[PDB]
Amino acid sequence: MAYHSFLVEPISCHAWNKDRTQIAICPNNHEVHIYEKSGNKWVQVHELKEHNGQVTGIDWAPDSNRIVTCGTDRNAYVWTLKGRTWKPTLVILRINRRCVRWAPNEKKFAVGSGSRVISICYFEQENDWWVCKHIKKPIRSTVLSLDWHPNSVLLAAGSCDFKCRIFSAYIKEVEERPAPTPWGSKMPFGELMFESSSSCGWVHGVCFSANGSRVAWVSHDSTVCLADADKKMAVATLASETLPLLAVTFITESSLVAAGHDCFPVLFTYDSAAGKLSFGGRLDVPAGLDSLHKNSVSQISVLSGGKAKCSQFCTTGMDGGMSIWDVRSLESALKDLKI
Amino acid sequence: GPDEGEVDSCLRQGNMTAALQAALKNPPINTKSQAVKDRAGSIVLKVLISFKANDIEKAVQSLDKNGVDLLMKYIYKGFESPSDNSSAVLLQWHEKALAAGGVGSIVRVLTARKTV
Amino acid sequence: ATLRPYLSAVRATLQAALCLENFSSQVVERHNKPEVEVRSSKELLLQPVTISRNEKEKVLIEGSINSVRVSIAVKQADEIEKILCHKFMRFMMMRAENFFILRRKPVEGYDISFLITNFHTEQMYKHKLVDFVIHFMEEIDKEISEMKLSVNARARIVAEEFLKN
Amino acid sequence: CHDQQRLEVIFADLARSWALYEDEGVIRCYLEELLHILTDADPEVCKKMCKRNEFESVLALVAYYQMEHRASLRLLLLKCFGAMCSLDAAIISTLVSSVLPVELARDMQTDTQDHQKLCYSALILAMVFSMGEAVPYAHYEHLGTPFAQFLLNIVEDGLPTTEQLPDLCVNLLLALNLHLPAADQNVIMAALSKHANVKIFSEKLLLLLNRGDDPVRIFKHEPQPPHSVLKFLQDVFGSPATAAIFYHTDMMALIDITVRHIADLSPGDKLRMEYLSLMHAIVRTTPYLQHRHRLPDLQAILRRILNEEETSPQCQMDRMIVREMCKEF
Amino acid sequence: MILLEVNNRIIEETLALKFENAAAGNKPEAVEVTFADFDGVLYHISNPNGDKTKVMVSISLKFYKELQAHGADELLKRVYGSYLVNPESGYNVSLLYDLENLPASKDSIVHQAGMLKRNCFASVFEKYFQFQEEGKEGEAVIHYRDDETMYVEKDRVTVVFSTVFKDDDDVVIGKVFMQEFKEGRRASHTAPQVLFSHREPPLELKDTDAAVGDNIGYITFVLFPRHTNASARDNTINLIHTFRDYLHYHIKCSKAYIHTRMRAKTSDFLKVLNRARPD
């Protein structure tokens, strides 16, 4: 319930630090800004003007303390802190054409773009340079949202091809082998392990669970679809009376929260018993708007707690407001909400 | 396409609920023939047109979500051919459908790749 | 025929197709344009929907992931009203530079055309935009009527004054 | 607390006439004090103070306004009367029951050399008669067919000014005919039957009709009165002699406006039944079946209106009205 | 000015200036100017033979011959007389003024000379009026404009002008004004009768090489003895000669007012759109 008015224009990407001490964001500009928190008021500390266009994706490796960013500049920048100045390194994306996220291994990052090729990229210490191998198998459209599993070897991504596929970007030269998952045994770089059955709506949202058992995604057909490999890769969809969702993340192992064009963060729970998804309701209950943000949500990351028991949810939207939510206050407010 | 007789029987019976519920069965969305889609659209249009104003709420409330989406899409297809003052009834039906399925129905109608 | 539920379904459809977002061109290097206008990618174009309250006055909405093009053909009661409508629509079209939510030419087979871009959808309230469309229709009707009455009054006055001399 | 004391003291000093034999400057200061008090302070206090002792201060202000000969003081009193009318409905009924209306009329007829004063008088009279709750027969002796012909001449010919009084006179006309009686006992209709050479009033009423807004409804009180334009149009189109004001083309234009307003009106509203009744009257007294125009779309619209089986009572009343008015041939 | 001015302001002001400068006994200054008037009239005033003592005013019309055919010389001699002189080279009618010999009253001469075109066109009207007064029935077509022709013809007098409306909208506005002028007998009962013809001329002007079209118009002005009298000759003539010009000017005025209303409505709507933004 803590919205902070930072800018008037929309927001592109929302990133956080290791100890969540600093927050990084871009305001649809050729530069990216990094602000910290000193008291009740927030103040900007760093500014990076390396990119040559509107910044689309940005993710910060917590343990590595190193933030990579890639947008319309058709290039990637693996920025690392050098003394009192964040030095950027141009990691060649090798794409003729909107998403980026570090792995749990924090050693290689996936850059999903409009080149219809999930461009995985690892850092070669032998040549002191970043290399980006491109996984393009069974990919027909851009990669809207990309999220890893706990394995740090299998990536998930939604496409404009009306489907959310879970492929493998595992480079066997940057890590050890991958253990057998319930999503399959054969895990190879480029091998399609999973896919969606939808033929309508764009998969703007996609996120995997903490246990790595279930992978959920949000489609732009006013429908959300969560799949569980625990029940032979069963797919469970649900149509929301509200508008389409833009970002999707799981709070618990059976409770996920998501927002979008509805401009209001919503909560939902899926019963493993019956094998179907259910709607929890509106967690954001109160210009002329009936919600905090005056536009659609654009991103929703986790502040602290994990995907099994999030204690604080961070929400960035097209309203220019930083929405800081707490599960405790939300549960203390809506007594009819079962998590 | 759908079956004409199954609807004609309920139409002769006066039970509009059965006819409306049967008209949306096996919609020709996957079909490539525009004739089948035109037939289904005209059929649904005929079904909705004969309906009385005050009784529409019950029949509209009797339908399901998927049926609401199919009805919205079929109504959109029927909206491209406004004739015999069917536009007013289609408008009232659009209001009822909007109140029933919300913005999600029309959103599903626009995001659809294969429809009537 | 004419009702308020028509502009309510129009408002709802306008609210549904105001879910656009910024998207780069997949064909051109570092290019960014409206998807609904050029219609280059069939994967990004949604099924266009038309709404008609009558055989003469209607509104056609064609949405996209990065654009929403709304064409509106207003009612034509008489010839004078038609010429006036054409003149006003043209006069509004000339100032398309000011109205960044309208386009310089009307859609073929329609009276006027407004292209609500993703960039325009990102720098203006969607709710206020829908309100702008609805107000655009009701104001179109009312203003047209008022203009008609004023013109007729002027003609009557001029005729009377010339006849009195 | 201070405002009530200042208002009571002003009312007491003005009721002493001692105020009429006092300096114009002091009286101007007192009137300005009372006006500013009624305009900037709480409404409840002003309402209680004005209606105090059965509108004693109000009646006293009225009598003092009737005895005073100063133009500026009359303007200030008219403004204060406007505020008092904007305060509540009880003060409006009290002022309407007073002779303030008649005196305002007589002053409006006598002093034609004061534009602003005439305007404020027209506005105050329009606000006082905007309710149309009570109708004293004595007030008809000062404001009737003569004053009606005068205002009609003011609308048709106009005076030798900003000309913002023509629309104000039209507003006062619409307000006065709001509390009128049927075509047989209507003074306005009688004056309209007397001189039907007025084409301008028709055009102005037409613009007022196409606008859709009501120029009489300024305040928002409970039990709001009916629509002025509809009732006036009904009283005008209540008889051929009074409907004769409309010209050959103007009649067709008005038919177009009434039909369009009837068709655009959704089921459930209140104005639709009224516009339908007006359309019925326009085809009753006026020659509708003469040039047989605009009747086709009207027929289609009527057919779509009668097939409207709405559970609501408003649409049922409207359907009953159109069924009453279904003289089809 | 609602009604079109009949007198030419240029010639009147110039002549007034010259006369005022001359009455003071000041030095005679040369004058040279080319002016124009409605329906394509071409005026040109200059000093003859370089003589500052003489001022010549020339006027040229395309239908000068058709006007002279109806006795224009007699009317010009009656109006100007001594002022009328040999026409300038290329001009139709030229008047002369000597600075060395002038009268006291200047207003009459200026007001008369300023109505040059009116007096030039009044010939046929006067002839027809006298003809109607005499009662000699059973007795004209003047091409005042390039694509227009005015046709003039027991108890009444008919004057049907066949003009052209170039713009498509101007035809509509003109049709509205004519539709209002036809039933204009509601305002003043003593006024003349007004008829209008959309695409084809009246029965009188039939198969007389009548130019018919969607862009043409034949307006019939039916005057009576009350307006055709010698007492109200000048005024009625002043109006009738300027009927077309007044019509076009009025329609154009309507176009302008429409432009204003459009600008205002655009301002209101643009205000709504500006009110739809965040800040």
What does this protein look like?
The structure is cut from a larger assembly and holds chains A (339 residues), B (116 residues), C (165 residues), D (329 residues) and E (279 residues). With 116 residues, chain B is mainly α. Chain B is built from 7 helices and no strands. In chain B, 70% of the residues lie in helices and 0% in strands. Chain C is α+β, with helices and mostly antiparallel strands and 165 residues long. In chain C, strand 2 and strand 3 form a beta hairpin. The longest helix of chain D is centred in the first third of the chain and has 17 residues, at 24-40. Chain D contains 18 helices and no strands. The chains are: A mainly beta (339), B mainly alpha (116), C alpha+beta (165), D mainly alpha (329), E alpha+beta (279). The interface between C and E is large, with 38 and 39 residues. It is classed as endocytosis.
Calculate Rg of chain D over CA atoms: 23 Å
State the share of residues found in helices of chain A, binned by percent. Answer: under 10%
Strand content of chain D: under 5%
Q: Could you tell me the number of beta strands of chain D? A: 0
Oligomer category: part of a larger assembly
Listing every helix as H and every strand as E from the N terminus to the C terminus, the arrangement of chain D reads HHHHHHHHHHHHHHHHHH
What's the main sheet of chain D like? none
What characteristic shape of chain A results from the CA principal axes? globular
Gross morphology of chain D is elongated
Taking the sheet with the most strands of chain A, its summary is: 5 strands, antiparallel
State the helical fraction of chain D: 55-70%
Strand fraction of chain A equals 35-45%
Number of helices of chain A: 1
Secondary-structure-based class of chain A equals mainly beta
Number of separate structural domains of chain A: 1
Task: Report the count of strand segments of chain A.
Answer: 30
User: What's the CATH superfamily of chain A, by name?
Assistant: YVTN repeat-like/Quinoprotein amine dehydrogenase
Largest interface: C-E, 38 and 39 residues
Distance between the termini of chain D: 70 Å
CATH class of chain A, named: Mainly Beta
PDB class: endocytosis
Keywords: SPIN90 Arp2-3 complex, actin filament binding interface, linear filament nucleation activation, endocytosis
Entry title: Crystal structure of Bos taurus Arp2/3 complex binding with C-terminus of Homo sapiens SPIN90
Chain A: Actin-related protein 2/3 complex subunit 1B
